[PDB]
Ligand binder design. Structure first.
Ligand SMILES: *[C@@H]1O[C@H](CO)[C@@H](O[C@@H]2O[C@H](CO)[C@@H](O[C@@H]3O[C@H](CO[C@H]4O[C@H](CO)[C@@H](O)[C@H](O[C@H]5O[C@H](CO)[C@@H](O)[C@H](O)[C@@H]5O[C@H]5O[C@H](CO)[C@@H](O)[C@H](O)[C@@H]5O)[C@@H]4O)[C@@H](O)[C@H](O[C@H]4O[C@H](CO)[C@@H](O)[C@H](O)[C@@H]4O[C@H]4O[C@H](CO)[C@@H](O)[C@H](O)[C@@H]4O)[C@@H]3O)[C@H](O)[C@H]2NC(C)=O)[C@H](O)[C@H]1NC(C)=O
Ligand SMILES: CC(C)Oc1cc(C(=O)N2C[C@@H]3[C@H]4CN(C(=O)c5ccc6[nH]nnc6c5)C[C@H]4[C@@H]3C2)nc2cc(C(F)(F)F)ccc12
Ligand SMILES: [Ca+2]
Ligand SMILES: [Ca+2]
Ligand SMILES: [Cl-]
Ligand SMILES: [K+]
Ligand code: NA
Ligand SMILES: [Zn+2]
Length: 806
C-alpha cells in the first residue's frame, strides 16, 4: 500500500527514497506504482517542448513550461539546453574545435570533477564507424577524448548482466545476475524482466558504484530511470542536479537510453530504420553537452559513453527446436533464445538424467547451430558456472540463431530481426567505450578491453576505493591523464628449493623403464652447467612465476626447459621453454617410445610412478616440455624425466600432441620465436580459482597423482616481430589458452578427422587471458621484464579472440 495523497511540490526527482506508504517523487516511483497524485503535472512537464525559439528569449518565467528561456533560468538551473545558443549568441558544443582539457576547469565549490555515465543499450561497436555521418556529437566525444575500437561485454551478452557488470566490476556468476531471466532454487524464486520479484535486494550481489560512492561520502544521482520519463527530461534532471548547492549536489550520475537496442530488435543491427535512433541518441548527447556548456561544466565533467552489448541479425526461421532432438521434451524447462539453460521441469522426477539429455543434443545434425555443455566444461574465459542460478546444462548457440523448446513457443509466445546474448567474443556483440574529460587522455586510442575493468576506473575518477571485483586495477591506467592507480606486484609466498643430485637410480621403484643406458669431460662439464641453470636466461624470459600461496616446490633446470615442480601435486605447476624461429621438430625415437626416467634431484616419495598409469585403464600420460622440440638427441632424455610427466586421457593426448608437435613450431615461425609456459589447472568446484589439495575429485587410480581439470599454455613473443622472442627490446605480444582435460572429444563434432581439421578450432574456443590462468593456478607471471607494471597488467588482461576485423 501507498497512500498517494501527499504531494511532489518542490520534491521533483528527489534524491533520497521515501518508504511506503508515503508517496514517492523519485525517478523510480512510476515502476513501483507509488508516485504522488501530482507527479505528472509538476515533475513531467512537457509544455512548449525542449528547445528555445527566438521569441521565447527573455520571456516571463512560466512555471508550466518543460524548460525555460527567461533571464533567470541559468540561476534556477533549468534553461532549455539550447538556451544560450538561441538567445545569447552561443555556439553548440559540437561546433567548437576540440581543445585539450589539461586540468579540470570547474566552478568554485566543485570538490572533484563529476562523472557522467551515458549508457546506450544495444550500441554495437561498428556503429562508431558505420553511423559516424549521423552522430556528430558522439564522433566529437570519440575523436577528442579517449576511445577503444570496441569494449568486450560479459557473457551472456544480455542487458541486466552487462549493466550490473558495468556497475560492479564483477562477472555475472559473482554478482548473481546471470541472465535477464533466472530461477534461484534456494529462494525457490524467479527473476523476470516484467514484474516485482526483480526489485528484491537478494538478487543483486556485490557492491555497485552508487553504493561504493555513498559509503565513502560521495553523493550519487539515482541511476535508474522509469521507461516513461522522456530522454529530454532525464537530461534536464541531471543538469538540474548539477545546479544543487555543494553539500547536496551528487558527484556521479547515470543516463540510460533504451535505444538503439529497442529498434535493433525490430529491424536488425543495420536495418535502414536504425539511422533515426542513432540520430536521436546523438541529439541527446548534444543536449547534455550544450547543457554542461551553459553551466560552465563542459571542461570539468568526465563523461563516459558506454554500451552494454551489440546486436546481431537473428530471425524466427533460424531457431533450433529441442523437440527435434529430445523424446522427453516435456520433462525439461528451457531458458530459451540466444543461449540455452536446461533443468528438470520437476524435482520429483527421478527418471530425469542430464547425461542422456546432453548425449541427445551432441553432434546430432550436420549443421547443428548450438552445442551443449555441462556448465563446468564451458570455456573458462566465459566465467559462467559458479552460481546456483546457472543451470548445469548449457547451450552455446551460434551467432544469428535461437534455440527454443518446441515450435509452438515461437508462434504462440516473424516479429524480431535482431537479438543479442551470444558468446562475448562474437564481433556483433562488441560494444563501445569513449571517455571524455579532464581525467581522460586527449585524442587517444586504447586497445579493446573488457567491461569488468571499468568499475575500477570509475572509482579512480571519483577518488573511491573499489570494492573487491574482477577487474585488474591498473590495467586501464593508460586511459587516464591522472588519478592513475599504482599497484605493487603481489609478494611471493613460497620460495622454491633448488635440489641438486640427491638420489641414486636404484632408490626408485616406480615401475618405469627407459632404454637410456648408452654412454667425457667435454660433454659432462656441459650438462652439469645445464642442470645448474646455464641456459635459464633463454628459457625463462620474464623471470620465474611467483607462487602466491603456501606450498612446497622445486625449481628444476634443464638444457631446453625450466620447471617449478610441486612436491604436493607431484608434477610441475609451470614449465617454461623458448622455441626460436630456427628450431627443428624431431620425432620421439622408436627406442624412447615408452621411456620414463627417475629424476635424481627429486625423492621417490615426491615422484609419480608408471605403475599407476599401467593400472589406470582410463588414464595415460603426456609431457609438459615436449620431446619433439628437444634441442639435441642427448637433451631429449630430459624430456622423459618423471618430473616432466602429467596425467592425460588418451582423447586429450590427441589435442596435446598436435599442439606440441605442430602448433608450437608454427607459432614460432609466425611470431619469430615463442616463449611457452604450460602447466596443469585443478578447478573441480568450477570457481575460476586454484583448488587446494582437499578439493581434487579425481586421482590416477591407486595413487596420489591428482588429475588436472585443464591444461594451460601462455605463448609470448615480441610485439615487434622483427625481433626474436628471446631478444625483444619493447612491448610483448601474448596468446594463451586453458584447454579442458576431457576423456572424450565430444565437444569437437569433427574429431574423428585428422587433428589438422579440429584441434586448432578447439584451442581457439578455449582462448584465455593470462589473468584467468593466474586465478586458476595462484601464480603471478611476467615478474621481470623491462616493461612498466601497468603495461604488464594490460598484457595480462589481453584476450586473443580469433575473430576477423570489427
Ligand atoms: C571475482 O571477484 C569476486 C569478488 O572479489 C570474487 O568473489 C569472492 O571470492 C571469495 C572467495 O571465494 C569469497 O569469499 C568468501 O566469502 C564468504 C562470505 O561472503 C559473503 O560476504 C561477502 C562480503 O560482503 C559477499 O560479497 C558475499 O556475496 C555472495 O553471496 C551472496 C549470496 O549468498 C550473493 O548475493 C553474492 O552475489 C555473492 O555470491 C557469489 O559468491 C559466493 C561465495 O561467497 C558464491 O557461492 C555464489 O555462487 C556467487 O558466485 C557473501 O554474502 C565467506 O563465508 C567465505 O569463507 C569460507 O572460506 C574461508 C577461506 O578463507 C574460510 O576461512 C571459512 O571457514 C569459510 O568456509 C566455510 O564455508 C564453507 C562453504 O560454506 C564450508 O565448506 C566450510 O566448512 C566453512 O564453514 C569466503 O571468504 C567472496 O564472497 C566472493 N565475493 C563475491 C562478491 O562473489 C571472485 O572469486 C572473483 N572471480 C575470479 C575468477 O577471480
Ligand atoms: C539494472 C540496474 C541495477 O542497473 C541499471 C539500470 C538502468 C536502468 O534504469 N534501466 C532501465 C531499463 C530496465 C528494463 N530493461 C529492459 O526493459 C530491457 C532492455 C533491453 C533489452 N534487450 N533485450 N531485452 C531487454 C530488456 C532493462 C533495464 C534498462 C536499464 N540503468 C543503468 C545504467 C548504468 C550505467 F549508466 F552506469 F551504465 C548502470 C546500471 C543501470
Ligand atoms: Ca541491453
Ligand atoms: Ca577451484
Ligand atoms: Cl537469460
Ligand atoms: K593407463
Ligand atoms: Na567428437
Ligand atoms: Zn536487447
Amino acid at each position: 500500500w501507498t497512500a498517494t495523497s501527499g504531494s511532489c511540490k518542490g520534491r521533483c526527482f528527489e534524491l533520497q527514497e521515501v518508504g511506503p506508504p508515503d508517496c514517492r517523487c523519485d525517478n523510480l516511483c512510476k515502476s513501483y506504482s507509488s508516485c504522488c497524485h501530482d507527479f505528472d503535472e509538476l515533475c513531467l512537464k512537457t509544455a512548449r517542448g525542449w528547445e528555445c525559439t527566438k521569441d521565447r528569449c527573455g520571456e516571463v518565467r512560466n512555471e508550466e513550461n518543460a524548460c525555460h528561456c527567461s533571464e533567470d533560468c541559468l540561476s534556477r538551473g533549468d534553461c532549455c539546453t539550447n538556451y544560450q545558443v538561441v538567445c545569447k549568441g552561443e555556439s553548440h558544443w559540437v561546433d567548437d574545435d576540440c581543445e585539450e582539457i589539461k586540468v579540470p576547469e570547474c566552478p568554485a565549490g566543485f570538490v572533484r570533477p563529476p562523472l557522467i555515465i551515458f549508457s546506450v543499450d544495444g550500441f554495437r561497436a561498428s556503429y562508431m564507424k558505420k553511423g559516424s555521418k549521423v552522430m556528430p556529437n558522439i564522433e566529437k566525444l570519440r575523436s577528442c577524448g579517449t576511445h577503444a575500437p570496441y569494449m568486450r561485454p560479459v557473457y551472456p551478452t544480455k542487458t541486466f548482466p552487462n549493466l550490473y557488470t558495468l556497475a560492479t566490476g564483477l562477472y555475472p556468476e559473482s554478482h548473481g545476475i546471470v541472465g535477464n531471466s533466472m530461477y534461484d532454487p534456494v529462494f525457490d524464486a524467479s527473476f523476470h524482466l516484467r514484474g516485482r520479484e526483480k526489485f528484491n535486494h537478494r538478487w543483486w550481489g556485490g557492491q555497485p558504484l552508487w553504493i561504493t560512492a555513498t559509503k565513502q561520502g560521495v553523493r550519487a544521482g539515482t541511476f535508474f530511470w522509469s521507461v516513461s520519463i522522456p530522454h529530454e527530461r532525464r537530461i534536464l534532471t541531471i543538469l538540474q542536479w548539477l545546479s544543487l548547492p555543494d553539500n547536496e549536489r551528487p558527484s556521479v550520475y547515470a543516463f540510460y537510453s533504451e535505444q538503439p537496442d529497442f529498434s535493433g530488435h525490430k529491424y536488425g543491427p543495420f536495418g535502414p530504420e536504425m539511422t533515426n535512433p542513432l540520430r536521436e541518441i546523438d541529439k541527446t548527447v548534444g543536449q547534455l553537452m550544450d547543457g554542461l556548456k551553459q553551466l560552465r561544466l563542459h571542461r570539468c565533467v568526465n563523461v563516459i559513453f558506454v554500451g552494454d552489448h551489440g546486436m546481431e541479425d537473428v530471425t524466427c526461421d533460424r531457431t533450433e527446436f529441442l523437440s527435434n532432438y529430445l523424446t522427453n521434451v516435456d520433462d525439461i524447462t528451457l531458458v530459451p533464445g540466444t543461449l540455452g539453460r536446461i533443468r528438470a521441469k520437476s524435482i520429483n522426477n527421478s527418471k530425469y538424467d542430464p547425461k542422456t539429455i546432453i548425449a541427445a543434443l551432441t553432434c546430432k545434425k550436420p549443421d547443428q547451430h548450438f552445442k551443449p555443455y555441462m556448465k563446468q566444461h564451458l570455456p573458462k574465459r566465459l566465467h559462467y558456472a559458479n552460481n546456483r542460478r546457472i543451470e548445469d546444462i548449457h547451450l552455446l548457440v551460434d551467432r544469428r540463431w535461437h534455440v527454443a523448446r518446441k515450435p509452438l513457443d515461437v508462434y504462440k509466445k516473424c516479429f524480431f530481426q535482431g537479438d543479442h546474448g551470444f558468446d562475448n567474443k562474437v564481433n556483433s556483440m562488441q560494444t563501445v567505450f569513449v571517455g571524455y574529460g579532464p581525467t581522460f587522455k586527449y585524442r587517444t586510442k586504447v586497445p579493446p578491453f573488457e567491461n569488468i575493468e571499468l568499475y575500477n576506473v570509475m572509482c579512480d575518477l571519483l577518488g573511491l576505493k573499489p570494492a573487491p571485483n574482477n577487474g585488474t586495477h591498473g590495467s586501464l591506467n593508460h586511459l587516464l591523464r591522472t588519478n592513475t592507480f599504482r599497484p605493487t606486484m603481489p609478494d611471493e609466498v613460497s620460495r622454491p628449493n633448488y635440489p641438486g643430485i640427491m638420489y641414486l637410480q636404484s632408490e626408485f621403484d616406480l615401475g618405469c623403464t627407459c632404454d637410456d643406458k648408452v654412454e667425457n669431460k667435454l660433454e659432462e662439464l656441459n650438462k652439469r652447467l645445464h642442470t645448474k641453470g646455464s641456459t635459464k636466461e633463454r628459457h625463462l624470459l620474464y623471470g620465474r612465476p611467483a607462487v602466491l600461496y603456501r606450498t612446497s616446490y622445486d625449481i628444476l633446470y634443464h638444457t631446453d626447459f625450466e620447471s617449478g615442480y610441486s612436491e604436493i601435486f607431484l608434477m610441475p605447476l609451470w614449465t617454461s621453454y623458448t622455441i626460436s624461429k630456427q628450431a627443428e621438430v624431431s620425432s620421439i625415437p622408436e627406442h624412447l617410445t615408452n621411456c620414463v626416467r627417475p629424476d635424481v634431484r627429486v625423492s621417490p616419495g615426491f615422484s609419480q610412478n608408471c605403475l599407476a598409469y599401467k593400472n589406470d585403464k582410463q588414464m595415460s600420460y603426456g609431457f609438459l616440455f615436449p620431446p619433439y622440440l628437444s634441442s639435441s638427441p642427448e637433451a631429449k632424455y630430459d624430456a622423459f624425466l618423471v618430473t616432466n610427466m602429467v596425467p592425460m586421457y588418451p582423447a586429450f593426448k590427441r589435442v596435446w600432441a598436435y599442439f606440441q608437435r605442430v602448433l608450437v613450431k608454427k607459432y614460432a615461425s609466425e611470431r619469430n620465436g615463442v616463449n611457452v609456459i604450460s602447466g596443469p589447472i585443478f578447478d573441480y568446484n568450477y570457481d575460476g580459482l586454484r583448488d587446494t589439495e582437499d578439493e581434487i575429485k579425481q586421482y590416477v587410480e591407486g595413487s596420489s597423482i591428482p588429475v588436472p581439470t585443464h591444461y594451460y599454455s601462455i605463448i609470448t613473443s615480441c610485439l615487434d616481430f622483427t625481433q626474436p622472442a628471446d631478444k625483444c627490446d619493447g612491448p610483448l605480444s601474448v596468446s594463451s589458452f586453458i584447454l579442458p582435460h576431457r576423456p572424450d572429444n565430444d565437444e569437437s563434432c569433427n574429431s574423428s578427422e585428422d587433428e589438422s581439421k579440429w584441434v586448432e578450432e578447439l584451442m581457439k574456443m578455449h582462448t584465455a587471458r593470462v589473468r584467468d590462468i593466474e586465478h586458476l593456478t595462484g601464480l603471478d607471471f611476467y615478474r621481470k621484464t623491462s616493461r612498466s607494471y601497468s603495461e604488464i597488467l594490460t598484457l595480462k588482461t589481453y584476450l586473443h579472440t580469433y575473430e576477423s576485423e570489427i
